[PDB]
């Protein structure tokens, strides 16, 4: 609905939450459809949740047994970096990914002692904790982000955006203030006004 | 830019002359108003766009007000029939 209200029907959202263009886009279409990190973070979190829910659905259909389910949940939580692409819009999630990798190492080398290689390790509780504690701090950020986006959708954009003095604007603003200073001095001292 | 202005006036005079021909042919087409570039754009003929009336002073203006109204409506009838 957010895609369609913005008129971007030339973008399609898969039922596994990939966003793909339906056609090669014009430049005006590309500028008009340039969705931001708020949308994409939301989309990829839905994608992650979709993967987890789909494994439970597979278990409940009888397609995979409980051990396969445990291993699947563990694999998803360890391989968010490959399955989800969420780092592209929030690169600080690499801490979570790195923590999951470290946890996988210590869990495996406790688990696989005298077993050897191959799938089967379903002890998914630590990585699960990592991602929940990430969601803790991601809730206020995404609430602010998505709120501002949807506010722009309904209320529209503020008329009076005051640009700050960043270093790209520094010299121009210096010139304006210097010019005004010279003009104030000379128009004050001239007798004829 | 002056080339663009020339072309714009060419298109305007095209519409004007075509409207005049059709008026001589007895099919009275109305002139097309310009398209609004944005939803809140202004047509300056519909209203006195930001009317700031003179603040009323001590002297009565009524007689010369109705005289000015007479003058304006006379001019309007004149341009209607004489062009």
């Amino acid at each position: 609905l957010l895609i369609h209200r913005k008129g971007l029907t030339y973008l399609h959202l898969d039922y596994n939450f990939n966003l793909k263009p339906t056609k090669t886009l014009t430049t005006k279409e590309r500028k008009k459809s340039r969705l931001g990190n708020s949308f994409h973070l939301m989309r990829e979190l839905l994608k992650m949740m979709k993967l987890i829910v789909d494994t439970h659905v597979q278990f409940r259909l009888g397609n995979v047994d409980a051990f396969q389910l445990a291993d699947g949940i563990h694999y998803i939580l360890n391989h968010i970096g490959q399955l989800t692409g969420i780092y592209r819009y929030k690169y600080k999630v690499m801490h979570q990914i790195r923590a999951c990798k470290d946890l996988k190492h210590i869990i495996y080398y406790k688990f696989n002692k005298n077993l050897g290689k191959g799938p089967g390790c379903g002890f998914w509780q630590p990585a699960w904790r990592v991602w929940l504690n990430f969601l803790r701090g991601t809730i206020p950020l995404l609430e602010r982000y998505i709120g501002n986006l949807i506010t722009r959708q309904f209320e529209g954009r503020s008329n009076e955006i005051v640009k700050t003095t960043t270093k790209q604007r520094l010299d121009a603003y210096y010139d304006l203030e210097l010019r005004n200073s010279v003009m104030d001095d000379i128009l004050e001292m001239m007798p004829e006004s | 830019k002056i080339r663009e202005r020339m072309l714009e006036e060419s298109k305007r005079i095209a519409e004007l002359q075509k409207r005049r021909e059709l008026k001589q042919a007895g099919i009275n087409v109305a002139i097309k108003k310009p398209k609004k570039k944005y939803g809140t754009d202004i047509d300056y003929n519909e209203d006195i766009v930001y009317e700031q009336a003179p603040m009323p002073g001590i002297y009565d203006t009524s007689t010369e007000d109705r005289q000015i109204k007479k003058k304006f409506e006379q001019f309007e009838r004149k341009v209607n029939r004489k062009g």
């Binding site: 339906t22 056609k23 090669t24 886009l25 014009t26 | 060419s10 298109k11 005079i13 095209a14 002359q17 075509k18």
Partner: protein
């Protein structure tokens, strides 16, 4: 690349084909007008081609105001074409 070769991409053309099949949608301005009118059988689509001739003569007549001779020639030729379309839907 430009708008034109994006619009003439295989995906866009296939979507146009699917839309004219699935819902009857066809932007006639994309397509070359029939030279011979009599091969057109529907009153609806013949009238739509007539509309194309109409918007064409409007856009040409905007440019009439070598130039006058060639554009007058094309203008009266398009009026001949318009006559043929009106004749065809009238018969």
């Amino acid at each position: 690349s430009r708008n034109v070769d994006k619009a003439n991409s295989v995906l866009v053309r296939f979507q146009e084909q699917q839309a004219e099949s699935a819902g009857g949608y066809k932007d006639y301005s994309r397509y070359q007008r029939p030279r011979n009118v009599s091969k057109v059988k529907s009153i609806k689509e013949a009238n739509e081609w007539k509309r194309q001739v109409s918007k064409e003569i409007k856009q040409k007549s905007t440019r009439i105001y070598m130039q006058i001779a060639e554009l007058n020639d094309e203008l009266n030729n398009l009026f001949k074409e318009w006559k043929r379309w009106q004749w065809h839907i009238d018969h």
